Design a protein around this nucleic acid. Structure first.
Ligand SMILES: [K+]
Ligand SMILES: [K+]
Ligand SMILES: [K+]
Ligand SMILES: [K+]
Ligand SMILES: [K+]
Ligand SMILES: [K+]
Ligand SMILES: [Mg+2]
Ligand SMILES: [Mg+2]
Ligand SMILES: [Mg+2]
Ligand SMILES: [Mg+2]
Ligand SMILES: [Mg+2]
Ligand SMILES: [Mg+2]
Ligand SMILES: [Mg+2]
Ligand SMILES: [Mg+2]
Ligand SMILES: [Mg+2]
Ligand SMILES: [Mg+2]
Ligand SMILES: [Mg+2]
Ligand SMILES: [Mg+2]
Ligand SMILES: [Mg+2]
Ligand SMILES: [Mg+2]
Ligand SMILES: [Mg+2]
Ligand SMILES: [Mg+2]
Ligand SMILES: [Mg+2]
Lengths: 117, 151, 42
RNA sequence: UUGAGCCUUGAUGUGUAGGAUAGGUGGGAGGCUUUGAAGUGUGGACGCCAGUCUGCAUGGAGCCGACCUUGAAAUACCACC
RNA sequence: GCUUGAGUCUCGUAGAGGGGGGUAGAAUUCCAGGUGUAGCGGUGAAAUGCGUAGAGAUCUGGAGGAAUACCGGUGGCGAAGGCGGCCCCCUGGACGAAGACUGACGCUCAGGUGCGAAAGCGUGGGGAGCAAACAGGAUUAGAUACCCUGGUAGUCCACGCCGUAAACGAUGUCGACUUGGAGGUUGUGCCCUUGAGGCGUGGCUUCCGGAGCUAACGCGUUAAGUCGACCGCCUGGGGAGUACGGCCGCAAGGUUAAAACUCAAAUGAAUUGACGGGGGCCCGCACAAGCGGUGGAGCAUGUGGUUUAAUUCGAUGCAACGCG
RNA sequence: GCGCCGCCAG
RNA sequence: CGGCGAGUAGCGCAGCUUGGUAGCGCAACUGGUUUGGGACCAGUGGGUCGGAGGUUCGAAUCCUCUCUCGCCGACCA
RNA sequence: GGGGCUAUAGCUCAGCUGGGAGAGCGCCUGCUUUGCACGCAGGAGGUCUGCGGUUCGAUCCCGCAUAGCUCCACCA
């Protein structure tokens, strides 16, 4: 198919879920997987394992593109910031960079109100 | 227990074969302290298992155990007011304890004539799979695989 | 795969995400900033 | 750019037996045949990786047929799809 | 008259002090495209919601509002309320240094006047995010809540009004005096400044603690100590900071402020316990790991009840019920 | 995640 | 006066159209859980379908009359 | 009317495939928990009605039978 031998894995690690989107360097998505879509729901969905499994399922579904080197970009606090990067390496990619791109406002917009649980 | 965390003791070897493993198996099978009754049932059932499948007496027994011994099982942890069914590696002693308990439990459910037949069939079943004890093992593994997230 | 990204600890990245999750009323930060440094004592 | 039709020329078909990823039949006994073959290098092609389909090279005239195993038997060529 | 209180001038210093204008970067949301495909989001778990009409994710471009990460500090400034990116303009105060100047010009302050968080109100703008009200989803016996998904006033700006807050140090202002210790911050003087030294002297400020004080807790040179000047305020709990009247306000309400009636208390601090869905550490067949029962059947036995002439009396959560 | 209540005098 | 509708378990309601067998929630009952109440859990039970007559082998169900209770109409003068 | 379409677990819905009945929620056990939910793992549960076609057609040619579905409707 396309000549993509070096892309970027975008890891969106929320508290509730992990989305892994592999893309070319220009930012066009090639494939993706989520902890939510990998047969993990509710409490199991928000685990480092479900994120691992998602990263496995995302490594598959960019086999056709023929990627070898990927930079990793990790958003979010959630479980599976790190279990996702391990899984990408274990799936036989050459991890090149690991940036963190969690957006911090320099003050900015008022967050929602504190939960009273 | 809280303080002194000691248990178990010396056992005699099986009279016939000289196997502590097999002596435990008799104890699982025994009821109401009728050990003579139990070891008669085991020997009858092993005799049949030996002539049926070939092999030695204990060699046939161990093969049945190999196919029912669980590797992992779910526990319960309570982290922050929330019960997770965490899978934990079952120790070697408990490994064959559950194996032996599930075989006996299965054998007592079967609707054959003698316990010795019931048991012999269940040992044969276990050695080839398809039995109720191997279903227990399989079920225990599926439970543990489902909760691999909580490790 | 040495994964020593302790630079995230250095930038207190996870720290800053946790504090920004919900609004802290000015009164509440003041109280915890005062309680933080009263506790910082021999 | 992008479909839709049509023409022409190519490629394509995974019961279980299994030369073995078999659409129906004949003018039906061979032809594509030194606008070169046995065997091997490479690439394209799909995949239920078993395998087949071949271009470009090289080697440089031989691969091949119908038998015996199957519901279905030549795809030995060709012709109607 | 005098210069010690108070003030003026000179030279500097630090500062989120105030008003006005400008601008920067991050982030959220929305909009338009590209890539891409079945989930996203959310929770304790869900669902509502969003998504094949292509969401979420990712990249590009644009719009717009609000707030200024790090610095950042029991740091600073301000009468208090308060004030935090950077730049400029206008402007207030504080402190230090020596020296000159005026000559008690001071302190306090009823009434009065001004300033005064947030919410709220008026008119006109603005509106990203957040979010009373509201709606739906949950939870629950119910759930007009807490949790979730949305979401309007409002939050933002201009001008005006309101005049209140646990507007707190629950501590009025001014002045004097009275053992110490460790810091922070900001000046300034002297000394081999001989390297993020040493010895002084000011201002502001944090913590500890001595005498003293205090019901105690604590306060302790920034006093709640020892005194002086002036002001404000209190007089049992409730009724009530309410009613009536006045004044103020567009309104909401504010402010001033009773009485009848009712009770023998209400209250502060500290003490011993007990308790906690507070914390820490421990134990017991408490749980877990197991094995065998009870609850179903028939019968024995005790009890409740009912019945009876009488069904003698007692035992009644655990710790009465095969018990006296 | 859910956990409401405890008549009068003594 | 005329018209429509309703009458089913203690209460609130399905079922009737289209004949065979009456449901549902709450309440009530017994047991369990609690020191005890509530809640919760597990077991039960309780109606001949307002009254009468008719058709039918058989009527809550279809037809007729009646009682009770609602609702609507009662206009032009 | 004449056509073209779907009509499968009790509910739900895919099954381009001529080599076959699958998921989630109910219901039944087991683990689970102070119980209760919550969650997790097993387990049952049958493909309008007939022919044709055969190498097998929940799956296709053909004809009927169903509710759904739109078009003609001066259907006189
Ligand atoms: K200034
Ligand atoms: K909101
Ligand atoms: K709004
Ligand atoms: K004391
Ligand atoms: K009084
Ligand atoms: K008229
Ligand atoms: Mg005054
Ligand atoms: Mg305001
Ligand atoms: Mg306004
Ligand atoms: Mg306005
Ligand atoms: Mg909300
Ligand atoms: Mg006041
Ligand atoms: Mg204040
Ligand atoms: Mg006061
Ligand atoms: Mg004054
Ligand atoms: Mg002190
Ligand atoms: Mg008043
Ligand atoms: Mg008044
Ligand atoms: Mg136990
Ligand atoms: Mg009994
Ligand atoms: Mg008695
Ligand atoms: Mg007594
Ligand atoms: Mg007792």
């Amino acid at each position: 198919r396309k000549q993509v031998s070096d892309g970027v894995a975008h890891i969106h690690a929320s508290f509730n879920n992990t989305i892994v989107t592999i893309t070319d360097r220009q930012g066009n998505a090639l494939g993706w997987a989520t902890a939510g879509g990998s047969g993990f729901r509710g409490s199991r969905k928000s685990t480092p394992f479900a994120a691992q499994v998602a990263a496995e399922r995302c490594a598959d579904a960019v086999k056709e593109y023929g990627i070898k080197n990927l930079e990793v970009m990790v958003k979010g606090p959630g479980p599976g910031r790190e279990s996702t990067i391990r899984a990408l390496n274990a799936a036989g990619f050459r991890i090149t960079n690991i940036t963190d791109v969690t957006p911090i406002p320099h003050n900015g917009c008022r967050p929602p109100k504190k939960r009273r649980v | 227990p809280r303080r002194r965390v000691i248990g178990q003791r010396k056992i005699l070897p099986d009279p016939k074969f000289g196997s502590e493993l097999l002596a435990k198996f008799v104890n699982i099978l025994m009821v109401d302290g009728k050990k003579s009754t139990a070891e008669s049932i085991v020997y009858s059932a092993l005799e049949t298992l030996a002539q049926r499948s070939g092999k030695s007496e204990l060699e046939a027994f161990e093969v049945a155990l190999e196919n029912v011994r669980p590797t992992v099982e779910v526990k319960s942890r309570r982290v922050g007011g929330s019960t997770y069914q965490v899978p934990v590696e079952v120790r070697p002693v408990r490994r064959n304890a559950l194996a032996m308990r599930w075989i006996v439990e299965a054998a007592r459910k079967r609707g054959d004539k003698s316990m010795a037949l019931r048991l012999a069939n269940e040992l044969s079943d276990a050695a080839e799979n398809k039995g109720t004890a191997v279903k227990k093992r399989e079920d225990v593994h599926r439970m543990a695989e489902a909760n691999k997230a909580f490790a | 795969d040495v994964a020593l990204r302790r630079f995230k600890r250095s930038c207190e990245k996870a720290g800053v995400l946790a504090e920004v999750r919900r609004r802290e009323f000015y009164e509440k930060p003041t109280t915890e900033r005062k309680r933080a440094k009263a506790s910082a004592v021999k």
